[PDB]
Design a protein around this motif. Sequence first.
Motif, PDB file in Angstrom:
ATOM      1  N   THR A   1       0.843  -1.190   0.000  1.00  0.00           N
ATOM      2  CA  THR A   1       0.000   0.000   0.000  1.00  0.00           C
ATOM      3  C   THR A   1       0.877   1.239   0.000  1.00  0.00           C
ATOM      4  O   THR A   1       0.416   2.319  -0.359  1.00  0.00           O
TER       5      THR A   1
ATOM      6  N   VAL B   1      -2.730  -4.018  -6.858  1.00  0.00           N
ATOM      7  CA  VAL B   1      -3.914  -4.740  -7.279  1.00  0.00           C
ATOM      8  C   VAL B   1      -3.923  -4.947  -8.779  1.00  0.00           C
ATOM      9  O   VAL B   1      -4.214  -6.033  -9.295  1.00  0.00           O
TER      10      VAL B   1
ATOM     11  N   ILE C   1      -1.283   1.137  -3.768  1.00  0.00           N
ATOM     12  CA  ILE C   1      -2.244   0.061  -3.575  1.00  0.00           C
ATOM     13  C   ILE C   1      -2.926  -0.262  -4.902  1.00  0.00           C
ATOM     14  O   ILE C   1      -3.145  -1.399  -5.264  1.00  0.00           O
ATOM     15  N   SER C   2      -3.212   0.771  -5.685  1.00  0.00           N
ATOM     16  CA  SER C   2      -3.819   0.521  -6.965  1.00  0.00           C
ATOM     17  C   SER C   2      -2.892  -0.302  -7.876  1.00  0.00           C
ATOM     18  O   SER C   2      -3.323  -1.237  -8.549  1.00  0.00           O
TER      19      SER C   2
ATOM     20  N   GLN D   1     -13.249   0.483  -1.445  1.00  0.00           N
ATOM     21  CA  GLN D   1     -12.008   0.990  -2.105  1.00  0.00           C
ATOM     22  C   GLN D   1     -11.413  -0.103  -2.959  1.00  0.00           C
ATOM     23  O   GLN D   1     -11.100   0.081  -4.118  1.00  0.00           O
ATOM     24  N   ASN D   2     -11.270  -1.296  -2.380  1.00  0.00           N
ATOM     25  CA  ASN D   2     -10.593  -2.373  -3.105  1.00  0.00           C
ATOM     26  C   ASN D   2     -11.413  -2.869  -4.293  1.00  0.00           C
ATOM     27  O   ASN D   2     -10.872  -3.208  -5.344  1.00  0.00           O
TER      28      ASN D   2
ATOM     29  N   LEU E   1      -9.943 -10.952  -2.017  1.00  0.00           N
ATOM     30  CA  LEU E   1      -9.936  -9.631  -1.459  1.00  0.00           C
ATOM     31  C   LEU E   1     -10.259  -9.718  -0.011  1.00  0.00           C
ATOM     32  O   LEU E   1     -11.375 -10.076   0.333  1.00  0.00           O
TER      33      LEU E   1
ATOM     34  N   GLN F   1     -12.891  -0.155   3.320  1.00  0.00           N
ATOM     35  CA  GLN F   1     -11.713  -0.764   2.717  1.00  0.00           C
ATOM     36  C   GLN F   1     -12.172  -1.686   1.582  1.00  0.00           C
ATOM     37  O   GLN F   1     -11.586  -1.713   0.497  1.00  0.00           O
TER      38      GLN F   1
END
Lengths: 324, 301
Positions: free
Chosen positions: B199, B238, B234-235, B267-268, B257, B264
């Motif tokens: 992250t 992923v 974090i993006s 967001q994910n 996930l 959270q």
Amino acid sequence: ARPATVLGAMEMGRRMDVTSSSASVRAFLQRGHTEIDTAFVYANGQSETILGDLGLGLGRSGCKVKIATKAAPMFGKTLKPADVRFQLETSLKRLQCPRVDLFYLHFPDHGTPIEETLQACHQLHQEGKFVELGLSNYVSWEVAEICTLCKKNGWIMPTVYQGMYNAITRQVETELFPCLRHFGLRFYAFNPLAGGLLTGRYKYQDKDGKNPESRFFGNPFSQLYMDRYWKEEHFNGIALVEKALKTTYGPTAPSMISAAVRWMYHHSQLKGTQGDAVILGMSSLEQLEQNLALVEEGPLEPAVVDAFDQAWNLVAHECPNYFR
Amino acid sequence: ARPATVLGAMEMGRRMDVTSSSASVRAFLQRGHTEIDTAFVYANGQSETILGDLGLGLGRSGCKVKIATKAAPMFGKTLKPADVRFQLETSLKRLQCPRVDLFYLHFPDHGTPIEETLQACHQLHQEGKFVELGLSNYVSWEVAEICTLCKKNGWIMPTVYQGMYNAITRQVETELFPCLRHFGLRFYAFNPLAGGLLTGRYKYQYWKEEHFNGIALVEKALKTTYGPTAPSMISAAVRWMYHHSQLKGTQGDAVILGMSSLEQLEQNLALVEEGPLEPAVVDAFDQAWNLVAHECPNYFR
Ligand SMILES: NC(=O)c1ccc[n+]([C@@H]2O[C@H](COP(=O)([O-])OP(=O)(O)OC[C@H]3O[C@@H](n4cnc5c(N)ncnc54)[C@H](OP(=O)(O)O)[C@@H]3O)[C@@H](O)[C@H]2O)c1
């Protein structure tokens, strides 16, 4: 107790003439060792031939010398039943012996279903043509598949694995070694000197110059060795070890080759009580006599062991695979 | 297609209350995802219990949610036959369902011979209690032994493996992944953010200096490539999983996930839908992996 020592006979009949090959066997036996490793493909058949002429009486009850050979899916052969039989039967003739003590699948034939090959191995065993079955260059999970098939089918199980392992080549430790311990295979390490790279005689820029005949230049399998070990990282690691040798011992320090050998016998995961062994390699009698003396040396100081770990850490991300 | 997304439900009843857990499921299903992952051991049993109380009609004809659970050698239990049965029967009760879609061996019980465990799994499958068998945290060679036993004995074969895998945790590629492809198992990746390291929220002030050096390389490539519109760390992490890893959506591979809150999770869920990364950023992740490969945690136990 330390790991056993096995004589690598790959150069017998290639860079080593009959005279030097015979002398090497005598030297090896005089040191108290007993196992010799050859293969159907070594020196295009001359390694086995030379060994089979030494009047050693291989495979006969009363032989103290133990002989290993291998069948390979190369030279236009596969590991189909007929080809496995062809190779072993040919090896027995060359070796002038009724049975070998250890018979390996040299490396995988991914074009032949493994159970077919194993069934052939079992039949050859039942005929009395080999005592123990071995594997080399199979991935851990292939070893487990093989052992499970043999168990379920009532076939001879492999009891030896021969694989690539040295102070800076440790991929086998993670998944293979626990598998072998689980299924009861002892491990014989090849390339203990990384084909000579761990002697310290080379430098990276060397490939850009003319070089004398050696494992890395002029060998029928040199390209395989360049891809395996000729990387800047291997060279930087060796450099750390050479530095720690001096820092710890001073100008009287053991040589790089001494260090690399002692690492195998005193600081690796090989265990003598499990039957594990190191396969020595050589391209001359002189090298062998040197190496045979190095086997008897003791452990290294921690700082040097730490240096080898550091070197491994540098190269781990590009370690050659132990399987094919 | 891209890898699938599986909801990790371990925090339902631990860090997450009933209300948040329910909302989390709705948000996940709203995005078109369908598989939920729980376990007998999660949250002292409350994860399954909360999922069972949501009214999803799990395990039934026409349910659009797929449920996975797991049996473990924990809480005094082993993977001996009676204990595997006990755990699945308990899970069925808690999840309020007649079967689960996927039942895992959560991690190895080295004290119980695996063929004994497997026979019990076969029996439970013959009773209709689960559709597919899964494995988690088994080493590649153990997976091969299992598959070979199952084939020889005529028992249900495992078809799913759940294991650790992320941009800087790639040990599974070498030996595990070829084994899975050989024997026909799809792979579900957990810990896609490496414990939070990926992250970018943590700095040097177990993770070593080379770890933070790796993250720095990726941050630098992100800024050089995209400038002020760069994906966040974090993006990027992923997006690596979904676009640049060895996961194959056509093999049924997936990413688990995790969530400790509804926020959270939302967001994910959004990150999952983002696109590929430019090559320089992918190269940086490879460089980061190369810095820490030598000390990768094992994916097995
Ligand atoms: N199963 C397999 O796939 C497989 C593969 C490889 C080997 N093996 C077996 O393992 C055996 C040993 O493996 P390996 O030969 O690669 O071992 P190694 O010790 O890693 O390499 C041997 C080479 O290192 C150099 N060397 C050895 N001793 C030396 C010394 N005292 N001073 C200077 N240089 C020295 C020589 O290179 P130069 O020739 O350049 O002088 C020698 O040919 C082989 O004979 C074979 O039996 C099996």
